[PDB]
Design a binder for this molecule. Structure first.
Ligand SMILES: *[C@@H]1O[C@H](CO)[C@@H](O[C@@H]2O[C@H](CO)[C@@H](O[C@@H]3O[C@H](CO[C@H]4O[C@H](CO[C@H]5O[C@H](CO)[C@@H](O)[C@H](O)[C@@H]5O[C@H]5O[C@H](CO)[C@@H](O)[C@H](O)[C@@H]5O)[C@@H](O)[C@H](O[C@H]5O[C@H](CO)[C@@H](O)[C@H](O)[C@@H]5O)[C@@H]4O)[C@@H](O)[C@H](O[C@H]4O[C@H](CO)[C@@H](O)[C@H](O)[C@@H]4O)[C@@H]3O)[C@H](O)[C@H]2NC(C)=O)[C@H](O)[C@H]1NC(C)=O
Ligand SMILES: *[C@@H]1O[C@H](CO)[C@@H](O[C@@H]2O[C@H](CO)[C@@H](O)[C@H](O)[C@H]2NC(C)=O)[C@H](O)[C@H]1NC(C)=O
Ligand SMILES: *[C@@H]1O[C@H](CO)[C@@H](O[C@@H]2O[C@H](CO)[C@@H](O)[C@H](O)[C@H]2NC(C)=O)[C@H](O)[C@H]1NC(C)=O
Ligand SMILES: *[C@@H]1O[C@H](CO)[C@@H](O[C@@H]2O[C@H](CO)[C@@H](O)[C@H](O)[C@H]2NC(C)=O)[C@H](O)[C@H]1NC(C)=O
Ligand SMILES: *[C@@H]1O[C@H](CO)[C@@H](O)[C@H](O)[C@H]1NC(C)=O
Ligand SMILES: *[C@@H]1O[C@H](CO)[C@@H](O)[C@H](O)[C@H]1NC(C)=O
Ligand SMILES: *[C@@H]1O[C@H](CO)[C@@H](O)[C@H](O)[C@H]1NC(C)=O
Ligand SMILES: *[C@@H]1O[C@H](CO)[C@@H](O)[C@H](O)[C@H]1NC(C)=O
Ligand SMILES: *[C@@H]1O[C@H](CO)[C@@H](O)[C@H](O)[C@H]1NC(C)=O
Ligand SMILES: *[C@@H]1O[C@H](CO)[C@@H](O)[C@H](O)[C@H]1NC(C)=O
Ligand SMILES: *[C@@H]1O[C@H](CO)[C@@H](O)[C@H](O)[C@H]1NC(C)=O
Ligand SMILES: *[C@@H]1O[C@H](CO)[C@@H](O)[C@H](O)[C@H]1NC(C)=O
Lengths: 585, 585, 585
């Protein structure tokens, strides 16, 4: 026969399983994979923020005030011409009684350029007097005075001046505060003190007085101070620091830096949370917040030596949390510490069923967006695994439908599983498969008649005459299948009174009736069955998100204070220099 | 026959539908479910923020200023030695003319410790004088003066001092402001007044003067004030409050708290929005913002009595919104009020087609994340419903393919629908199904030949000899199907010149040709057809989100003011106490 | 025959392909669509923020201070009665030497109301003296003085006063700053200057002095200033501005507005980013941030003329970025500029493989939420395209299973592809299809027996007698299929000893055995096969997101300063007016 093997359904061809081809078998007894197993670890999670508030402590301020008024007796009239005020500090010989028993000496002495000035209340004798309270606006501040009334009696002889002078003792009790570098502190009344509040424990002080330009500093040991309930059951001794600036004395009780302040504070605690491991990081889940916190794969070393000041709090918080779960869970592993990109610190303790970034970010939105994405992702990936084993259990039945169809005739199954024409035959329980041979398009002609030379026999398919490539002798058969040449003839039972056919070729159809040919008609004129099932899936669609604000930048400005400092200081400078000042003309 | 029933395809067995087994029927005329119906309610949504700005009102301040300068005539030279200033309040006998006609009395009297001081401009006679404007830096502040020039003429006789004195009247017109507890207010020039701005309507005042330490307070009825356009068409009478602190008099017009301020403000309004009900909450949708607001299932009671001050605004806003939709929608139900976790208040009005949390959260990101999640979720759940009815319409056709295959032989369909060997037979329009019986593995032997004792008949399957368990007599048949024993023989039409077979057993294959046995070969040597269609689905993948900031914490600090208050007050204290002050040595 | 065509399987009917009906063909040689192609453009992206920091520059302040002290010699005692201070500006004849060589004239003259006052240090002669440094608290401020010590020696004769007077020269070197409208500037020590810092380049100044109420302003050309290293290699000349307010002289070096400040600053640069086009906008992607920025479809015009001050920076940044990619990419198109809703500006440069909104939003969360949504959406839409071509390749095999089943008998395939009974016949390679005819329910009766009048022939289906609508003559056949009447009879091979049947009708079943009828039984008593495969898909579920804060509104307040301005100014007003002031009684 001819050389070229068939590769499409368009050329005329001769097929036969007449040779020892390749053998195939239906591989029955398949199975789909089983359901996977998935696991996770529970534990206690504690979350730490970096601290932000200033340090806050109580202080006392001691002063003596000298005042001088100039008055003019005049005649039938009198006036104040001036009033001057001079504050000064208080020495330790007096602070003793002034904080013990609320007494002071009604007079003062002031060295200036090496000469001694003196001031005495109402020009009377140096004598001891008692301090008493005065009313206040703000409940955290208390104030005590020795003499509420300024002296301005005009005097007895007409036409000349006199000077009137007074002395006060003052105590104030109030708050003071300071921030991260601890170089200085600021008092509630606005006094700025320029000494570190821990300075004795940093060994920057002594019982012998220290000195600086504009300061003297000392520590007094076993000092005692009495509350104005003024009662003999005196408070316990302390060590107290004393600062003697120009214009006042100030004092506070000594304390250590590492007991006073620690850099971190507890934000929240979750007694049930889960750890999952990814390619580059760990994820820790907090359901009550709707958030997840991530961290690098390596825990932070030395969190017992750096931040050692937390060792009071993590132990009691883990011990209380473990005692709450002790009926259902028991600890595993050991305590671990992690630092989140974003600036938070995590404490973790694994549980089993019993059966750096100093710029801490203020906005936590990325922790909630991670929780939403990690709830969508496994919810979608579970549908893909449930869809894929429902598909595989169908392909195991399709392979049995093709097996039962193959026992009827195996050729029509092989040219359905392959995309190309082949011929096939059973040789036992295995199927032998074989190539098919092309025949030339020009030797092929189809006969115009179907009734036989016998009186009552009719061909069910039209006769065809042909020859192979590179040959002279002719051959004949019947037009079979799509465009096949069949070598063995077949017939209808009788040439019954009426008959019709529409034989189909690759392009055209031949129409026959009364056992003879009539016309050639295009195949597209015959209507075609549709057996397909439509999906009509609708795809996800685009959204543009918007920038939104609850309060305007102006409303955020006006809410910050009732004071308008930007205009308050501009008017004070304009008034005191241009309007009210001495001015040339 | 033997007792044990077949449970796999590996042991040799005898099957027959020779007994009255159970009956089965193909249940034709199935259907898939129909498409569901889904519904939602439209309405108008108004959203309220808690208010944040201070209260703002106009005030007047009245003062008299006495000044005294000391000058020294000297000889061939002269200098100022001192300048002192004394502000005082203004009494009602003068405020009358001073706010009516812009006049004041050019002199003042000052009681101190029970004696009367007097100050007069340039030592001249007590006389009436007119106030006039002066220029200002800030456009909200106006200032008026009676005498712009301070007096410092040195005098005529050498070598002795003199005192020069002046008196001013001042008015200032300006803003003042106050915040949430309303205990006090602060003036634009920095004066703090320590009285509540509504105090007469709270019955904390009277027409008889009230008193406090450092204050006097009074209400004046039917008071009148004239604008500096100074024109006879005088403004309408008012009730005005007067405060007389040390150093000034201050006044403002009386007003009621419930007309002055209300705690909430309207943020946005949506004329088309949708309500959906979930297991624990309601969700309200705003498309123009790309956001959704949630609330508890119970509306807030008494929002007409608490927040009654909004009853002017919600009525006109709902009436305008309803009139905008009146061509396509008509109201249903009644107005309802809800409080969102996050601190916003919602107003809702249902429409039909015609056919607490005082910590208000500043960042609205959770409202946009809820809108994105509620756009993904129903978009994915719609694909699952469209995929599930496309699958069911295919299973209704697979059930018809198995029916048409069963009419050819029902055994091969029953052992495809069940996972196990059984035998089956039609008894009418119903199929009778029956168990199959195991035979021992040791009595089975397969014959080495296929040609019969007849001269031209050949067996299509090899002969087998066997016996049942607990028996002596032998039996024979043909090797059928996978590993079956068949009791009725079958043959090929003729012993044609050439023949070949590859019979398959559970492990091994037997090869025969020329109608006799030759070899045993492993089944895995025969190539197997693959008819499966691959899915190749690709799963969703992990993303790590990052912390991001547009401006540094330092840039947010430097943007807050041009004033550097942290260093401005430190230098003023250092200069006035250490550098410039009187200092001992 | 009767008129009504069959529309269900419930009525009895007669079917035959006895007429020339419509022709159908199996449309083989189908294909599914091929895989789509998808494309995107890479480029360099630069992102610009609006600037927020104030302008910052160096200044000098020059002063002369006159002081006067009053002291009383007295007897056996002495005291200070007053101390007064008077600051004044410095004239250009002196600023020359004072900034060149650090010298000043130890005396001053002060015009007031047209008469000249004079002050001289310690009453000594007018002489030149040298300035020297003093220590400072804050490292950005330097201060120089001519006389550190105030003079207060009491004097020699008992019982009378004397006045002591001193003069200082002061220089201060420090920072000053100003903001967006540029109307004024504020010095580090709190001095507010009320002149624009660029005023000479805006032609608001001259070398002839300008004047305002309370100011004089001048520009000095080629001025020179010497650093206190005080060395003959003098710095280069400048043009310097001079302001002469009351109480001081102040100076700064002249500069142009367009070189000093530009409104925008570079935030980040991405050398690989991608542009995608949507229905109304463009999206630009930044992977290292996990964010995408959107913009309108039209680029902004005139960004080379408005914001021309950026032309130094975008050129060098694009040139450096292009040189980094020059081994793998080459430029295409040209540079384009876009303005994002949210207030950022984008610069874009396309690359190829070689082979307005002044309210800038501070919170970028919407840019990360867009990146998450645009990672979910194409990840889900890819699964729908991979699922849809896996479905289509199966429907192309189902169409071949129906073709092979149709060659056995075409009726049972046509009533599976249609939902209704029809009859069909092959007329060649095409199938002729025909309607079926209803018969009345009352003429139908089923015979009680199956054995024939012949001695050993039995009917496989029971006999039926019937007639057509509007007729008298009777007909007979066999009960076939579901509820069909068949006109041609068929039989079992022999009336074998035992036989049983369960014939099924639309409601009831008839049971027969020993070739005769016995009972009528409901069809539901016969057990039915189940061949369906379950999906068990589980749908996505609802989540309620929460409002979260890292720091309380109180902690955000307390972190803003160590100063408590809200109480500091309230106590100063209470103390100086009520407690310490002159008060009537
Ligand atoms: C105690 O005693 C001391 C003295 O020991 C007193 O100090 C004296 O104070 C008086 C005023 O009270 C001074 O009198 C006045 O002098 C000025 C300056 O005159 C000279 O400079 C003028 C400007 O030239 C500048 O620019 C040129 C370049 O163009 C430059 O070369 C100069 O160096 C100069 O300075 C500038 O450049 C410097 C270097 O870069 C800079 O540092 C500097 O800041 C400048 O930028 C110049 O025009 C003038 O020439 C004319 O006038 C002089 C007289 O001064 C005359 O001799 C010439 O013939 C010219 O006609 C000088 O070179 C001067 O300008 C003043 O004149 C004005 O004011 C009067 C009214 O007072 C008007 O009538 C005039 O019209 C004019 O407006 C005045 O003469 C005195 O000089 C000064 N002495 C010293 C040593 O400095 C102190 O006041 C006493 N205190 C008490 C309390 O008693
Ligand atoms: C500063 O204060 C700390 C805390 O009080 C001191 O540390 C203590 O030192 C004593 C003696 O070694 C120990 O017994 C305590 O346990 C320590 N406490 C802590 C918390 O450290 C420290 O010695 C002080 N330093 C100085 C020099 O005063
Ligand atoms: C405080 O002000 C309110 C508001 O003006 C006063 O309430 C009014 O009272 C009158 C008389 O009963 C009513 O007619 C008005 O309708 C009320 N208005 C409102 C808005 O309440 C209240 O009486 C005043 N209280 C005092 C004591 O002055
Ligand atoms: C203000 O300053 C700007 C910048 O120095 C001046 O503009 C310059 O003008 C000169 C002369 O035309 C040009 O050669 C420069 O190229 C310009 N530079 C810039 C950046 O503009 C401007 O002339 C000044 N205006 C005045 C009146 O002084
Ligand atoms: C005819 O059939 C051939 C394939 O053999 C096809 O390529 C062509 O498009 C068809 N149409 C005609 C009639 O050319
Ligand atoms: C926790 O419990 C253990 C065992 O009682 C105890 O030793 C430890 O001090 C506790 N830690 C704290 C402080 O909670
Ligand atoms: C042989 O078949 C049995 C099942 O009957 C199977 O378990 C075994 O793995 C197969 N292989 C052999 C030859 O043991
Ligand atoms: C709304 O309209 C009704 C009917 O006109 C009216 O009674 C009611 O006062 C209106 N409310 C407001 C203030 O909008
Ligand atoms: C109000 O809403 C309910 C529920 O949707 C509906 O049954 C009823 O008909 C509506 N009535 C009006 C007035 O639209
Ligand atoms: C009987 O069959 C009819 C359809 O022909 C059906 O509508 C009905 O529900 C069935 N049940 C009976 C016995 O009524
Ligand atoms: C970029 O490079 C070109 C070519 O060298 C040059 O002309 C241009 O000035 C450069 N721009 C800058 C400033 O980077
Ligand atoms: C520029 O881009 C367009 C569109 O992708 C492309 O057709 C063209 O070839 C590109 N040219 C260069 C220079 O890469």
């Amino acid at each position: 026969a001819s050389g070229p093997k068939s590769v499409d359904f368009y050329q005329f061809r001769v097929c036969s399983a007449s040779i020892t081809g390749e053998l195939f078998r239906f591989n029955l007894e398949q199975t789909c994979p089983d359901t996977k197993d998935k696991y996770h670890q529970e534990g206690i999670l504690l979350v730490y923020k970096k601290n932000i508030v200033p340090h806050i402590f109580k202080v006392r301020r001691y002063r003596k005030i000298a005042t001088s008024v100039t008055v003019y007796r005049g005649l039938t009239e009198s006036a104040i011409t001036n009033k001057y005020e001079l504050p000064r500090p208080v020495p330790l010989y007096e602070i003793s009684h002034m904080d013990s028993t609320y007494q002071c000496f009604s007079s003062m002495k002031v060295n200036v350029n090496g000469v001694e000035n003196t001031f005495t209340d109402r020009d009377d004798v140096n004598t001891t007097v008692f301090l008493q309270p005065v009313e206040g606006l703000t409940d955290n501040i208390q104030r005590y005075f020795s003499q509420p009334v300024i002296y301005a009696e005009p005097g007895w002889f007409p036409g000349i001046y006199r000077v009137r002078t007074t002395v006060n003792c003052e105590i104030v009790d109030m708050i003071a505060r300071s921030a991260e570098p601890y170089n200085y502190f600021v008092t509630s009344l606005g006094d700025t003190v320029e000494v570190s509040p821990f300075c004795y424990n940093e060994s920057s002080c002594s019982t012998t007085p220290s000195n600086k330009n504009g300061l003297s500093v000392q520590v007094v040991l076993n000092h005692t101070v009495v509350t104005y309930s003024d009662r003999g059951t005196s408070p316990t001794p302390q060590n107290r620091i004393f600062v003697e600036t120009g214009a006042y004395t100030l004092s506070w009780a000594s304390e250590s830096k590492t007991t006073a302040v620690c850099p971190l504070a507890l934000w929240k605690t979750f007694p049930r949370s889960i750890q999952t491991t990814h390619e580059d990081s760990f994820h820790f889940v907090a359901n009550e917040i709707t958030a997840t916190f991530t961290a690098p794969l390596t825990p932070v070393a030395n969190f017992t030596d750096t931040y050692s000041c937390l060792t009071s709090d993590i132990n009691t918080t883990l011990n209380a949390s473990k005692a709450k779960l002790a009926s259902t869970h028991v600890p595993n592993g050991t305590v671990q510490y992690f630092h989140t990109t974003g600036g938070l610190y995590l404490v973790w303790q694994p549980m089993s069923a019993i059966n750096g970034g100093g710029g801490s970010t203020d906005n936590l939105s990325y922790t909630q967006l991670q929780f939403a994405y990690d709830k969508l992702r496994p919810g979608i990936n579970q549908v893909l695994e449930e869809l894929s084993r429902a598909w595989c259990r169908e392909q195991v039945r399709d392979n049995l439908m093709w097996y039962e169809l193959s026992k009827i005739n195996p050729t029509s199954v092989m040219t359905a599983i392959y995309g190309r024409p082949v011929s096939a035959k059973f040789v036992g329980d295995a199927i032998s498969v074989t190539e098919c041979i092309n025949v030339d398009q020009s030797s092929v002609n189809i006969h115009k008649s179907l009734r036989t030379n016998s009186k009552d026999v009719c061909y069910a398919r039209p006769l065809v005459t042909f020859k192979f490539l590179n040959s002279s002798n002719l051959f004949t058969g019947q037009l079979g299948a799509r465009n096949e040449i069949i070598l063995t003839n077949n017939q209808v039972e009788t040439c019954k009174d009426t008959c019709e056919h529409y034989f189909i070729t690759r392009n055209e159809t031949l129409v026959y009736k009364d056992y003879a040919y009539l016309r050639t008609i295009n195949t597209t004129d015959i209507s075609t069955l549709n057996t397909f099932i439509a999906l009509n899936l609708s795809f996800i669609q685009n959204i543009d998100f918007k920038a939104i604000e609850l309060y305007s930048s102006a409303e955020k400005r006006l809410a910050s204070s009732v004071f308008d400092l930007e205009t308050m200081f501009r008017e004070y400078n304009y008034y005191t220099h241009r309007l009210a000042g001495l001015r040339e003309d």
